[PDB]
């Protein structure tokens, strides 16, 4: 791509500069360039990739929600096609970013990921971006998109349970997001609550094994699980 001529190390360096500057679109482009070099990503690099795209898509999701709501209120005086047009524009751009991320995961991050930490990380991402596609899906394929999210989260969950301690932050964040998928996308609030509780409880029981810094890392995501449980019960 447009980053083809830049050194991998330079792209990573610039991704970090872009993060410091809160330039997430640039950060994402730098990391896409780095992935397209064809080498596996390190832990730190994977995190840079995730943060970049999470922020980009996060902004798009927030704007889509503002627009979709304005649209819904318009469909309860006639304002013409503009609200629908502009929501569609934002939606299409969001879909594009999700397709780009899914493309990177498929070519060829997931297939080269052998260690649990990387494989779970990339499958969670795959679940997340199909979840974002699901949030805006209304055509026939809402179901298949939902199943694609579910399948990726499930594979990640199966690996995480076999290969990671209950306090592992990736495992915790995966469970958090799969529990959100159940509640918000799959119309399965009981499953969401059950998942969040079991995850929280099993992590608590394993905190005794951790260093002070790991304990801080694990308890943080645990608090997000607790926050959801409080909202949902």
């Amino acid at each position: 791509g447009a980053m083809g001529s830049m050194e991998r190390a330079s792209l990573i360096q610039k991704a970090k500069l872009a993060e410091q500057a809160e330039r997430y679109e640039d950060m994402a482009a730098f990391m896409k360039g780095a992935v397209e070099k064809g080498e596996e990503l390190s832990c730190e690099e994977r995190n840079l990739l995730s943060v970049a795209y999470k922020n980009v898509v996060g902004g798009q999701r927030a704007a889509w929600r503002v627009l979709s709501s304005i649209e819904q209120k318009s469909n309860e005086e006639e304002k013409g096609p503009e609200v629908r047009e502009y929501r569609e524009k934002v939606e299409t751009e969001l879909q594009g970013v999700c397709d780009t991320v899914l493309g990177l995961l498929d070519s060829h991050l997931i297939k080269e990921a052998g260690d649990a930490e990387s494989r779970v990380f990339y499958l969670k991402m795959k679940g997340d971006y199909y979840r974002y596609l699901a949030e805006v899906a209304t055509g026939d394929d809402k179901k298949r998109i939902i199943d694609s999210a579910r399948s990726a989260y499930q594979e990640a969950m199966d690996i995480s349970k076999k290969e990671m301690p209950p306090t592992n932050p990736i495992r915790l964040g995966l469970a958090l997001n799969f529990s959100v998928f159940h509640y918000e996308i799959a119309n399965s609030p009981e499953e969401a609550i059950s998942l969040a509780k079991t995850t929280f409880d099993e992590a608590m029981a394993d905190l005794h094994t951790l260093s002070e810094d790991s304990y801080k890392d694990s308890t943080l995501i645990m608090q997000l699980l607790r926050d959801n449980l409080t909202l949902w019960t």
Binding site: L172, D227, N228, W232
Partner: peptide
């Protein structure tokens, strides 16, 4: 709800 919150995600990570």
């Amino acid at each position: 709800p919150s995600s990570w």
